[PDB]
Amino acid sequence: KKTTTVGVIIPDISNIFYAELARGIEDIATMYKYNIILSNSDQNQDKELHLLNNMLGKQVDGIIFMSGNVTEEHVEELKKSPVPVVLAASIESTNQIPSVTIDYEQAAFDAVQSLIDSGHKNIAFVSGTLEEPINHAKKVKGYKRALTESGLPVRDSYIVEGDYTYDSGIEAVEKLLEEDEKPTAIFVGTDEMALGVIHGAQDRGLNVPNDLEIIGFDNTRLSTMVRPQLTSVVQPMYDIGAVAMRLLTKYMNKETVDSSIVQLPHRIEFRQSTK
Amino acid sequence: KKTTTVGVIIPDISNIFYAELARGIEDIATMYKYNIILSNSDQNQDKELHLLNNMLGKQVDGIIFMSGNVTEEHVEELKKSPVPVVLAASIESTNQIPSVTIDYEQAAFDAVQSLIDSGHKNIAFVSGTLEEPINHAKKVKGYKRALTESGLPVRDSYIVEGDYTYDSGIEAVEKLLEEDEKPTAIFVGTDEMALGVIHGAQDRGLNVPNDLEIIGFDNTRLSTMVRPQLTSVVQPMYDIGAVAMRLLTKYMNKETVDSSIVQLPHRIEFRQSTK
Amino acid sequence: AQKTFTVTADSGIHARPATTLVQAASKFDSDINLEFNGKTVNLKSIMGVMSLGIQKGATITISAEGSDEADALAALEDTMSKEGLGE
Amino acid sequence: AQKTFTVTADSGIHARPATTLVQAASKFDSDINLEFNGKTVNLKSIMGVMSLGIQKGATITISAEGSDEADALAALEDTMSKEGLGE
Ligand SMILES: O=P(O)(O)OC[C@H]1O[C@@H](O)[C@H](O)[C@@H](O)[C@@H]1O
Numbered sequence: 001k002k003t004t005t006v007g008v009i010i011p012d013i014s015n016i017f018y019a020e021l022a023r024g025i026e027d028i029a030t031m032y033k034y035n036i037i038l039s040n041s042d043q044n045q046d047k048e049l050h051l052l053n054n055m056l057g058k059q060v061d062g063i064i065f066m067s068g069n070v071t072e073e074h075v076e077e078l079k080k081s082p083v084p085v086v087l088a089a090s091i092e093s094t095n096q097i098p099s100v101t102i103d104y105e106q107a108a109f110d111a112v113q114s115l116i117d118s119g120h121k122n123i124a125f126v127s128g129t130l131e132e133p134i135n136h137a138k139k140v141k142g143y144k145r146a147l148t149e150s151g152l153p154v155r156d157s158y159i160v161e162g163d164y165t166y167d168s169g170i171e172a173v174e175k176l177l178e179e180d181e182k183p184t185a186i187f188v189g190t191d192e193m194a195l196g197v198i199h200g201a202q203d204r205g206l207n208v209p210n211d212l213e214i215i216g217f218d219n220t221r222l223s224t225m226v227r228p229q230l231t232s233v234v235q236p237m238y239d240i241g242a243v244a245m246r247l248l249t250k251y252m253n254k255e256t257v258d259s260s261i262v263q264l265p266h267r268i269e270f271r272q273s274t275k
Numbered sequence: 276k277k278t279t280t281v282g283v284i285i286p287d288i289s290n291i292f293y294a295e296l297a298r299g300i301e302d303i304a305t306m307y308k309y310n311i312i313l314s315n316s317d318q319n320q321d322k323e324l325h326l327l328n329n330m331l332g333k334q335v336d337g338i339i340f341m342s343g344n345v346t347e348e349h350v351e352e353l354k355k356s357p358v359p360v361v362l363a364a365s366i367e368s369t370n371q372i373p374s375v376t377i378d379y380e381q382a383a384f385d386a387v388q389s390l391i392d393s394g395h396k397n398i399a400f401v402s403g404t405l406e407e408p409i410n411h412a413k414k415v416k417g418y419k420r421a422l423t424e425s426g427l428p429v430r431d432s433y434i435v436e437g438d439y440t441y442d443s444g445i446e447a448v449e450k451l452l453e454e455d456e457k458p459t460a461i462f463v464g465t466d467e468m469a470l471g472v473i474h475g476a477q478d479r480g481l482n483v484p485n486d487l488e489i490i491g492f493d494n495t496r497l498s499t500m501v502r503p504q505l506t507s508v509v510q511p512m513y514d515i516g517a518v519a520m521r522l523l524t525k526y527m528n529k530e531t532v533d534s535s536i537v538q539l540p541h542r543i544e545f546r547q548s549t550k
Numbered sequence: 551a552q553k554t555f556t557v558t559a560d561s562g563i564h565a566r567p568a569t570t571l572v573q574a575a576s577k578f579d580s581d582i583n584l585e586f587n588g589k590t591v592n593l594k595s596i597m598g599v600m601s602l603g604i605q606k607g608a609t610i611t612i613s614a615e616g617s618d619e620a621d622a623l624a625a626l627e628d629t630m631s632k633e634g635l636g637e
Numbered sequence: 638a639q640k641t642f643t644v645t646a647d648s649g650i651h652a653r654p655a656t657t658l659v660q661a662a663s664k665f666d667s668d669i670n671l672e673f674n675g676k677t678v679n680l681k682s683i684m685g686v687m688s689l690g691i692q693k694g695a696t697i698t699i700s701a702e703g704s705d706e707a708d709a710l711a712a713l714e715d716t717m718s719k720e721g722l723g724e
């Protein structure tokens with residue numbers, strides 16, 4: 001009936017972002033004597049839904065699911081699952097499915113607010129795929145809210161979407177630099193794109209942070225592998241995977257659960273891309 | 276008797292290097308309807324040997340093993356395994372255990388040779404943990420052989436070991452720059468360290484590649500996320516994992532195997548860290 | 551019964567885009583091969599295709615021999631550009 | 638029955654070094670807790686310890702109450718520096 005092995009569905013294990021979450025999950029599974037069956041979905045809803053059956057059809061004591069877009073259809077099938085399912089670094093509005101993340105909306109806001117407190121009025125936002133709820137529902141809103149609350153304009157041409165790749169980061173700054181009212185600060189929704197934003201601007205000759213201040217998100221290892229060193233919002237990738245696994249072992253072993261909706265603390269690591 | 280799930284032992288899934296190999300393995304396993312049970316060992320021989328039993332004790336149709344140091348004791352237990360075992364990006368002198376890699380020694384040599392062909396006489400080598408055979412048995416030897424064959428001195432103070440971290444890359448250049456006869460070119464055994472070598476030198480004010488040319492190894496995504504863009508020896512991480520898995524499915528399904536010792540082609544991607 | 555291309559992918563024919571080109575040829579009946587630098591391999595084989603190490607700028611010729619030649623060759627030409635490999 | 642430290646780890650008490658500090662306290666019988674910013678949690682709990690988000694430079698106080706207090710507290714002080722967390 002029970003195998004002591006949990007299945008984990010992930011968009012792409014080769015991405016440092018997901019690879020970090022996987023290490024946390026794996027470590028805790030090990031700690032609590034569980035085995036993991038990892039499977040890449042590549043953000044393909046069809047693949048994702050299919051992989052769900054597979055894991056269940058191989059009877060696993062649990063499921064940790066990660067995805068950039070947990071749709072109503074996903075939620076429906078996840079509620080049907082015979083075993084405990086915990087979402088990691090992913091969100092669905094109803095909160096019916098257990099999940100571990102950070103307060104994205106609040107973190108985006110704090111990020112932009114620090115740029116405003118620094119005297120910035122023209123602040124842009126280079127975002128990842130706008131379709132994904134963490135982006136349009138949270139990060140974007142946190143960015144906009146910081147603007148409005150300080151009584152600043154909320155221009156849509158100041159928001160350009162990338163695709164998480166370092167190159168899109170480059171293409172984003174150039175597009176933003178084509179604007180008449182040049183931004184003086186840029187909040188990027190991901191470290192890899194922020195590196196592209198930093199480089200794309202240094203290739204255009206501007207200096208970071210003198211001509212343009214920048215802030216990234218996740219605080220991956222890339223943040224320290226840039227010059228200047230990237231100021232970045234901290235999302236504890238490992239902790240998220242670790243805690244999401246622990247939460248899962250609580251459901252699996254029927255322990256006392258305080259809340260199935262967990263938001264780990266976030267902060268900002270100020271480095272050199274900001275003044 | 277058979278589960279159609281192979282076990283993979285890996286030092287650390289969060290490292291981009293191993294995460295890349297894992298994606299290739301996973302993709303091919305999927306293609307051939309297999310499941311994977313990933314487990315981190317952290318280069319701990321005790322952990323590694325233990326994890327071997329675990330996988331076998333859970334009856335898996337195969338095992339893909341990765342490690343920086345496959346010792347005689349490891350080989351002994353691997354030969355004892357009831358199921359096909361293929362080594363990925365790892366080596367053991369006897370060639371008794373199937374493996375997929377590249378010709379490390381030849382690749383290090385080609386790397387240094389191009390620096391010599393470019394007019395360099397004082398060439399250093401920033402290496403990873405010297406204890407690991409790929410380093411002292413291959414990369415180092417390829418580096419030395421390129422030197423001797425061109426009738427150049429083989430100074431040991433020109434070889435400093437890092438620990439694969441970006442910081443060790445920084446510490447390595449500074450140590451190398453303390454040398455009386457400053458190197459004009461540096462071959463780094465890993466992309467992450469090469470970034471640290473590039474930055475550590477730009478922080479010391481020198482210019483790459485004018486004052487110092489640099490070449491890395493692996494050609495990860497970091498190579499293009501630096502300025503200048505890193506010239507790097509190409510090791511197809513994904514292909515290595517993919518092919519190592521395919522080779523494994525050949526043994527598992529008893530297909531025709533041409534050779535259990537595979538060395539995929541390597542080349543050098545010349546970018547900006549070289550002239 | 552065949553088409554020739556110039557690989558545009560900066561990564562050449564490797565990694566996932568190579569697993570994709572293999573997957574595609576495998577969905578046919580004909581006998582699809584890859585001709586490169588005077589070496590021909592089975593385009594339905596991961597090891598074979600990845601053992602060639604086809605870099606960017608190289609010239610390759612995919613061949614098809616079977617009851618669905620044109621279909622394979624045409625679908626692959628579509629995969630070639632769909633995957634940004636070449637044309 | 639307790640010791641106080643200043644976290645030196647630039648990453649603070651997180652990730653593996655946090656899983657290690659948890660693992661360590663868990664190897665005892667006493668009741669080990671972590672005191673931070675006026676909040677105490679069970680040092681043997683992953684969620685508890687990671688829900689505090691202890692950054693670098695913070696001051697924490699690990700406490701022990703059991704038949705092996707000094708042993709736990711001493712072993713943890715050793716883990717504290719062995720892991721570069723603080724002292
Ligand atoms: O690790 P980095 O480069 O900051 O990238 C993280 C991002 O990587 C993307 O692939 C994910 O879709 C995002 O959700 C994630 O935040």
Ligand SMILES: O=P(O)(O)OC[C@H]1O[C@@H](O)[C@H](O)[C@@H](O)[C@@H]1O
Binds near residue numbers: 492493
């Ligand atoms: O991906 P990068 O930064 O080039 O690092 C690769 C290296 O990472 C190290 O951790 C491994 O021990 C090496 O064997 C590997 O070559």
